[PDB]
DNA sequence: CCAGAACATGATGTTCTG
DNA sequence: CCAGAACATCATGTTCTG
């Protein structure tokens, strides 16, 4: 039921992992994109339904640690 | 000189009482009028510079107020 | 049911206007 | 020179399509 990356309502098993739709397409664009994402914090941001917008670097990192893969 | 007191980018002039760049100018005005409720994902002390200022509206808004920005 | 594209919408930053 | 609106361009998220 819950996205393992942002804890929003999950939609299905995506890229190996139970995630929401927004996290699905974020992760695909991160991996297949340039993107030199820079954290404004300490590389340990909270990733929420809301706070996931704030830090792509941490969102992407949390995706990987969740086992998201192509 | 001159530098934005909010994000350290080049200031374009004195806006809402403070030396700021144009982007911080419109950001502030947008924030003090808008919805908004912003949430920090870090520890309420994010680095706000030209690079990172898009990351944390909450901290950028905070720096705007600390610098003394206001509508009058 | 899922990947990937598309189509809205959001958030931002520069330019134009008063 | 500055405020506010308008325009353009993102990043993000939902819906359509394979
Ligand atoms: Zn998610
Ligand atoms: Zn971060
Ligand atoms: Zn600024
Ligand atoms: Zn912050």
Q: A23: domain range?
A: 1-70
CB burial of B30-56 (b: ≥16 within 10 Å; e: otherwise) equals ebeeeeeebebbbeeebbbeeebbebb
- The residue of chain A nearest to residue B37, with distances taken between CA atoms, is A50
Interface membership of A46 toward B (CB under 8 Å): yes
The size of chain A, in residues, is 70
Instruction: Answer whether A58's CB lies under 8 Å from A45's CB.
Output: yes
For an interface test with A, which of B41, B57, B60 has the most A Cβ atoms less than 10 Å from its Cβ? B41
Instruction: State the smallest CA–CA distance between residue A35 and chain B in angstroms.
Output: 13
Q: Which nucleotides of D are covered by protein (CB under 7 A)?
A: 1-6, 11-15
Select from A14, A16, A19 the least CA-distant residue to A4.
Answer: A19
Structural domain total, chain B: 1
Alpha carbons A57 and A50: distance in angstroms, whole number: 15
What CATH number corresponds to the domain at position B18?
Answer: 3.30.50.10
- The residue of chain A nearest to residue B42, with distances taken between CA atoms, is A45
Q: Is the Cβ pair A41, B42 closer than 8 Å?
A: yes
Q: Is the Cβ pair A48, B39 closer than 8 Å?
A: yes
The partner residues of A36 in beta bridges, in order of sequence, read: none
Please name the method used to determine this structure.
X-ray
Q: Would you list the DSSP string of A27-69?
A: HHHHHTS------SSSS-----TTGGGT-HHHHHHHHHHHT--
Its sign, for the CA torsion A45, A43, A64, A59, is: positive
């Amino acid at each position: 039921k819950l996205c393992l990356v942002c804890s929003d309502e999950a939609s299905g098993c995506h890229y190996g992992v139970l995630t929401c739709g927004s996290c699905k397409v974020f992760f695909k664009r991160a991996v297949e994109g340039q993107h030199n994402y820079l954290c404004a914090g300490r590389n340990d941001c909270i990733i929420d339904k809301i706070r996931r917008k704030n830090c792509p670097a941490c969102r992407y990192r949390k995706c990987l640690q969740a086992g998201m893969n192509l």
